[PDB]
Ligand binder design. Structure first.
Ligand SMILES: CCCCCCCCCCCCCCCCCC(=O)OC[C@H](CO[C@@H]1O[C@H](CO[C@H]2O[C@H](CO)[C@H](O)[C@H](O)[C@H]2O)[C@H](O)[C@H](O)[C@H]1O)OC(=O)CCCCCCCCCCCCCCCCC
Ligand code: CLA
Ligand code: CLA
Ligand code: CLA
Ligand code: CLA
Ligand code: CLA
Ligand SMILES: CCCCCCCCCCCCCCCCCC(=O)OC[C@H](CO[C@@H]1O[C@H](CO)[C@H](O)[C@H](O)[C@H]1O)OC(=O)CCCCCCCCCCCCCCCCC
Ligand SMILES: CC1=C(/C=C/C(C)=C/C=C/C(C)=C/C=C/C=C(C)/C=C/C=C(C)/C=C/C2=C(C)CCCC2(C)C)C(C)(C)CCC1
Ligand SMILES: CC1=C(/C=C/C(C)=C/C=C/C(C)=C/C=C/C=C(C)/C=C/C=C(C)/C=C/C2=C(C)CCCC2(C)C)C(C)(C)CCC1
Ligand SMILES: CC1=C(/C=C/C(C)=C/C=C/C(C)=C/C=C/C=C(C)/C=C/C=C(C)/C=C/C2=C(C)CCCC2(C)C)C(C)(C)CCC1
Ligand SMILES: CC1=C(/C=C/C(C)=C/C=C/C(C)=C\C=C\C=C(C)\C=C\C=C(C)\C=C\C2=C(C)CCCC2(C)C)C(C)(C)CCC1
Ligand code: SF4
Ligand code: SF4
Ligand code: SF4
Lengths: 142, 68, 81, 42, 158, 73
C-alpha cells in the first residue's frame, strides 16, 4: 500500500480565545484527537463545541476530545470551502496514529486494497433463531 | 438469442419473499438486468409505499410468481 | 467490537451510509454483485458510536446493513470526560 | 369557478356542513319529542 | 314486576320525585312578573317535565325502588320499546353507513392515485352511490352467497 | 353493579390485548420482521423508517402494567 501516513507535526493553532469546550481529564488520561489541514485564506468558521474562530495561512492544528467532533468539522470544511484534511489520535505514552483516510482517497468511493471485514453473503431474512445457537458464544448474525 | 431471464415487461408479480414489506404482494416488473453475475436482477414497482418511503427494490426469480 | 455492524448481499451499492457515517466506520469495496460492483464494509467498528442513521438511509427491501448492539466502552458511548 | 367546487369538495368543509345538518336534525327531533326515552310506537 | 320492580304508573317514589321537582321549579317561578318571558319559559318547562312524567307512566316502564326508571333488556318483547326495536333500528342505520362507505371505496379504488379521491371525495359519485342504503342487508347477502365479500390469501398491496 | 362489571370486563380485555400483542408479535411484524434476533429487551430500532420507540415485547409488558394497576384499582 503506497499510502503512507504524514506523521502529524507541531504547527500553529487557529486564533481563538480558549473556552469551556476544550479538553478535560479524559484527554489528559486516556486519549484525545488532533485535526490538521492547510487553509487557503484567513476566514471564520464555527468550532464544533461553541462559538467561532479564524484560521491562519498554511497548515493548521486543532485539538479536540472525541473523533466525532473532528470528523464533523472536517465534513464542514469539505462541504463549505473544498479543502482536504486529516486527523490523528494521540496516546499519553507519546504515540500518534493516523485514522481517517487510511489511503488518502475518501472512504466515500472505491479504492481496491481494503479488505472485507464483516460481510455476510445472505439476505437479512436468512438469519436463524436464538434457540438454534443458545448456550454457545455464537450469535445469529455471525 | 441467449434467452433473457425474468418476465418480459408489465407482468404483475406476486412476491414470494418473506422478509420484505410486500410478502404476498402484487407488484410490477420494470426491468431485469441480463447480466448473469447479478444476485438480484429483477426490480419491481408497487402502488403501496413502505415505511422507509421507498417504492422499489430488487429480487431474484425464485422469489417471484408470474401471476396474471 | 463494542457494537457490531453487519452487511447483507441485498446491498445495491448505492453508498448512502458512508456519506452519512458520522465517525468514519464504513466504506465501499469492489464486488461483483451489483451494477456498481461495490459492496459495503465495516473494518472500523471500534469507533462505531451506535446511531442508526447509517441504516436509516439504506433504501432496500427491508434493510441491507444492520447495527447490532452489544457491550459498552469509553468511545462507543460518545464520552468526552 | 370549478376550482372553488373542487375546493368545496375537500373533506373539512364537507364534513362541517354534513355534521351541522345532522346535529340540526337531531336537535329538531329532540324538540319535537322531548326526552324520548322509550320506543312507544310498537 | 321483574324482581319486584313495580311500574311507576303505580309506585310512589316516582310521584315524590315529580312532586319535589315541580315544587322547586314553582318556588323558583315566583321571583319575576307572572308574564315575563323567562317566567313563561319556566312554566313551559314545568308542564314539559310534567307531561314527561305522564308519558313515562304510559308505557309499562318498570320502575325502581328509589323512584327511577329501569330498563328490562332480558329479551322478553313485553319490554321491547327500550332495546330490541331501537337496537335493530340502529343496526339498520349502521349497516347502511358501513355498506355505503365500503361500496364507495371499492368503486373509487379504480383510478390513478385513489388517495386524491379519498381526501377530496367524488361528490358526484358520492351522491349517486350514497342512497343505496336500502340494499345493504340484501346486497351484501348475495355477496356472501357468491363469496365476493371476503378474500382468502391476498393481504398486502391490494 | 352492571356498569362496574362492564368497566371491569373492558379492563380485562384491553390488558389481555396488550399482553397478547406483546407475545405473538414478539418474533416480528412488518415493521421489524427480524426482531427475533434482537433478544427480549432492547431500546429501539432507530428513529428512521417511521420511528420505532417502544417496540420491544418488554415494552409491551411495560405498557400493560399500567392497565393492570388500573383494572385492579
Ligand atoms: C353496556 C354495554 C351493552 C350495550 C349498550 C347498551 C346500553 C343501553 C342502551 C339503551 C338504548 C335505549 C335507547 C332508546 C331510545 C329510543 C328513541 C326513540 O324511540 O324515539 C322515539 C321518540 C318518541 O318521543 C316520545 O313519543 C311519545 C309517543 O306518544 C305516543 O304514545 C301516546 C300515549 O298516550 C299516544 O297513545 C300515541 O300513541 C303517541 O302520542 C310521546 O309523544 C312523548 O312525549 C315523546 O317524548 O321520538 C320520536 O318519535 C322520533 C321520531 C320517530 C323516529 C323513528 C321513526 C322513523 C324511522 C327513522 C327515520 C329517520 C330518523 C332517525 C331518528 C333516530 C332517532 C329517533
Ligand atoms: C393517523 C390516523 C388517520 C387519519 C388522519 C386518517 C384520515 C382519513 N381516513 Mg382513515 N384510517 C386510519 C387512520 C387514519 N385515517 C386507520 C388506522 C384505519 C384502519 C385501518 C383507517 C381506515 C379508514 C377507512 C376505511 C376510511 C378512512 C378514510 C379517511 C379519510 C376521511 C375523509 C373524510 O373526512 O371524509 C369526510 C366525509 C364525510 C364527513 C361524510 C360524507 C358526507 C356526504 C358526502 C354528504 C355531504 C352532504 C381521511 C383522509 C375514509 C376515506 O378516505 O374515504 C371516505 C374511509 O373510507 N380511513
Ligand atoms: C337546519 C336544521 C333544521 C331542521 C331540520 C328544521 C326542521 C323543522 N323545523 Mg326548523 N328552524 C331551524 C332549523 C331547522 N329546522 C332554524 C335555524 C330556525 C330558526 C331559529 C328554525 C325555526 C323554526 C320554527 C319557528 C319552526 C320550525 C319548524 C320546523 C319543522 C317543520 C314541521 C321541521 C321539523 C316548525 C315546527 O317545528 O313547528 C311545529 C316551526 O314552527 N323551525
Ligand atoms: C351509547 C350511549 C348512549 C345511548 C344509548 C344514549 C341514549 C339516549 N340518549 Mg344520550 N348521551 C350519551 C350517550 C348515550 N345516550 C352521551 C355520551 C351524552 C353526553 C354528550 C348524552 C347526552 C344526551 C342528552 C343531553 C340527551 C340524550 C338523550 C338520549 C335518549 C334519546 C332521545 C332522542 O331524541 O333520541 C336515549 C335514551 C335525550 C334524553 O332525553 O335522554 C334520555 C337527551 O336530551 N343523550
Ligand atoms: C343465553 C343467554 C340469552 C340469550 C342468547 C337470549 C336471547 C333471547 N331471549 Mg332471553 N333471557 C336470558 C338470557 C338470554 N336471552 C335470561 C338470563 C333471561 C331471564 C331468566 C331471559 C328471559 C327471556 C324472556 C322472558 C324472553 C327472552 C327472549 C329472548 C329472544 C328474543 C332472544 C333470542 C324472548 C323470546 O323467547 O322470544 C320472544 C322472551 O320472551 N329471554
Ligand atoms: C365505511 C367504512 C368502514 C367500514 C365498513 C369499517 C368496518 C370495520 N371496522 Mg373500521 N374504521 C373506519 C371505517 C370503516 N370501518 C374509519 C374511517 C376508521 C378510522 C376512524 C376506522 C377505524 C377502525 C378501528 C380502530 C377498528 C375498526 C374495526 C372495524 C371492523 C369491526 C367494526 C368496528 O369495530 O368498527 C367500530 C366503528 C368505528 C371504528 C367507526 C368508524 C366508522 C367511520 C366513522 C365511518 C366512515 C365513513 C366515511 C369515512 C364517510 C364517507 C361517507 C361516504 C359518502 C363516502 C369492521 C370490519 C375494528 C376491527 O379491527 O375489527 C376487527 C377496529 O378495531 N375500524
Ligand atoms: C348533489 C350536489 C352536487 O352534485 O354538487 C356537485 C358540486 C361539484 O362537485 C365537485 O366538482 C369538482 C369539479 O368542479 C370536482 O369534480 C369534485 O370532485 C366534485 O366534488 O359539488 C359542490 O360543489 C357542492 C358541495 C357542497 C354541497 C352542499 C351544498 C349545500
Ligand atoms: C372556516 C373553515 C373551517 C372551519 C369550520 C368551522 C369551525 C365550522 C363550524 C361549524 C359550526 C360550529 C356550526 C354550528 C352550528 C350550530 C347550529 C346549526 C345550531 C342550531 C341551533 C338551532 C337550530 C336551535 C334552534 C332552536 C331555537 C333557536 C329555539 C327554539 C327551539 C330550537 C331548539 C329549534 C374548516 C376547518 C372546515 C376548514 C378551514 C375553513
Ligand atoms: C366567532 C369566532 C370565534 C369563536 C368561535 C366559537 C367560540 C365557536 C364555538 C362553537 C361551538 C361551541 C360549537 C359547539 C357545537 C356543539 C354541538 C353542535 C353539539 C351537538 C350535540 C349533539 C348533536 C348531540 C347529539 C346526541 C348525541 C350524539 C347522543 C345521542 C343523543 C343526542 C341527540 C343528544 C373566535 C373569536 C374564537 C375566532 C373567530 C371566529
Ligand atoms: C339518534 C339516536 C340513535 C342513533 C344513533 C346513531 C345512528 C349514532 C351514530 C353514531 C356514530 C356514527 C358514531 C361513530 C363513532 C366513531 C367513533 C367514536 C370513532 C372513534 C375512533 C377512535 C376512538 C380512534 C381509535 C384509534 C385509532 C383509529 C388510532 C389507533 C388507536 C385507537 C384505537 C385509539 C338511536 C336510534 C340508536 C337511539 C336514539 C338516539
Ligand atoms: C340480541 C341480544 C342478545 C343476544 C346477542 C347475541 C346472541 C349475539 C351474538 C352475536 C354473534 C355470535 C355474532 C357473531 C358474528 C360473527 C361474524 C363472522 C360477524 C360478521 C360480520 C360481518 C361479516 C359484517 C360485514 C359487513 C357488513 C355486512 C356491513 C359492514 C361492512 C362489513 C363488510 C364489515 C342478548 C339477549 C344476549 C342481549 C340483548 C341483545
Ligand atoms: S453506527 Fe451506524 S451510523 Fe453510527 S457510525 Fe457505526 S454505522 Fe455509521
Ligand atoms: S446499505 Fe444501502 S447504503 Fe449501505 S451500502 Fe447497501 S445500499 Fe449502499
Ligand atoms: S425515542 Fe423513539 S426515537 Fe428517540 S431513541 Fe428512543 S426510540 Fe429511537
Amino acid at each position: 500500500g503506497f499510502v503512507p501516513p504524514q506523521l502529524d507535526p507541531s504547527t500553529p493553532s487557529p486564533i481563538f480565545g480558549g473556552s469551556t469546550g476544550g479538553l478535560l481529564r479524559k484527554a489528559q488520561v486516556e486519549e484525545f484527537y488532533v485535526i490538521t489541514w492547510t487553509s487557503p485564506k484567513e476566514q471564520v468558521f464555527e468550532m464544533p463545541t461553541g462559538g467561532a474562530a479564524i484560521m491562519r495561512e498554511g497548515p493548521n492544528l486543532l485539538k479536540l476530545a472525541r473523533k466525532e467532533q473532528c470528523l464533523a468539522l472536517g465534513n464542514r470544511l469539505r462541504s463549505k470551502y473544498k479543502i482536504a484534511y486529516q486527523f490523528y489520535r494521540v496516546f499519553p505514552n507519546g504515540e500518534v496514529q493516523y485514522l481517517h483516510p487510511k489511503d488518502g482517497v475518501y472512504p466515500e468511493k472505491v479504492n481496491a486494497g481494503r479488505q472485507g471485514v464483516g460481510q455476510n453473503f445472505r439476505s437479512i431474512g436468512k438469519n436463524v433463531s436464538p434457540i438454534e445457537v443458545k448456550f454457545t458464544g455464537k450469535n445469529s448474525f455471525d | 438469442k441467449p434467452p433473457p431471464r425474468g418476465p418480459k415487461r408489465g407482468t404483475k408479480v406476486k412476491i414470494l419473499r418473506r422478509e420484505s414489506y410486500w410478502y404476498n404482494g402484487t407488484g410490477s416488473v420494470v426491468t431485469v438486468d441480463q447480466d448473469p453475475n447479478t444476485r438480484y436482477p429483477v426490480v419491481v414497482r408497487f402502488a403501496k409505499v413502505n415505511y422507509a418511503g421507498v417504492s422499489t427494490n430488487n429480487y431474484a426469480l425464485d422469489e417471484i410468481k408470474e401471476v396474471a | 467490537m463494542s457494537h457490531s455492524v453487519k452487511i447483507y448481499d441485498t446491498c445495491i451499492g448505492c453508498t448512502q451510509c458512508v456519506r452519512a457515517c458520522p465517525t468514519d466506520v464504513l466504506e465501499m469495496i469492489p464486488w461483483d454483485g451489483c451494477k456498481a460492483k461495490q459492496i459495503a464494509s465495516a473494518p472500523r467498528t471500534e469507533d462505531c458510536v451506535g446511531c442508526k442513521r447509517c441504516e436509516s438511509a439504506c433504501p432496500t427491501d427491508f434493510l441491507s446493513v444492520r447495527v447490532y448492539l452489544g457491550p459498552e466502552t469509553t468511545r462507543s458511548m460518545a464520552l468526552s470526560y | 369557478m370549478r376550482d372553488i367546487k373542487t375546493y368545496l369538495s375537500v373533506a373539512p368543509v364537507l364534513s362541517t356542513l354534513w355534521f351541522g345538518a345532522l346535529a340540526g336534525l337531531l336537535i329538531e327531533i329532540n324538540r319535537l319529542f322531548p326526552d324520548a326515552l322509550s320506543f312507544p310506537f310498537f | 314486576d321483574i324482581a319486584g320492580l313495580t311500574p311507576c304508573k303505580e309506585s310512589k317514589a316516582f310521584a315524590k320525585r315529580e312532586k319535589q321537582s315541580v315544587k322547586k321549579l314553582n318556588s323558583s317561578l315566583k321571583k319575576y312578573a307572572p308574564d315575563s318571558a323567562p317566567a313563561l319559559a319556566i312554566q313551559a318547562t314545568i308542564d314539559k317535565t310534567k307531561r314527561r312524567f305522564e308519558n313515562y307512566g304510559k308505557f309499562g316502564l318498570l320502575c325502581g325502588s328509589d323512584g327511577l326508571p329501569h330498563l328490562i333488556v332480558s329479551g322478553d318483547q313485553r319490554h321491547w320499546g327500550e332495546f330490541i326495536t331501537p337496537g335493530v333500528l340502529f343496526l339498520y342505520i349502521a349497516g347502511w353507513i358501513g355498506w355505503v362507505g365500503r361500496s364507495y371505496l371499492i368503486a373509487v379504488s379504480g383510478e390513478k392515485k385513489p388517495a386524491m379521491r379519498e381526501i377530496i371525495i367524488d361528490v358526484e359519485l358520492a351522491a349517486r352511490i350514497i342512497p343505496r342504503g336500502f340494499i345493504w342487508p340484501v346486497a351484501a347477502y348475495r355477496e356472501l352467497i357468491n363469496g365476493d365479500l371476503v378474500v382468502d390469501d391476498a393481504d398486502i398491496g391490494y | 353493579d352492571f356498569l362496574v362489571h362492564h368497566a371491569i370486563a373492558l379492563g380485562l380485555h384491553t390488558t389481555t390485548l396488550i399482553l397478547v400483542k406483546g407475545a405473538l408479535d414478539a418474533r416480528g411484524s412488518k415493521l421489524m420482521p427480524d426482531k427475533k434476533d434482537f433478544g427480549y429487551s432492547f431500546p429501539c430500532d432507530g428513529p428512521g423508517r417511521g420511528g420505532t420507540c417502544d417496540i420491544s415485547a418488554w415494552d409491551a409488558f411495560y405498557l400493560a402494567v399500567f392497565w393492570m394497576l388500573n383494572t385492579i384499582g
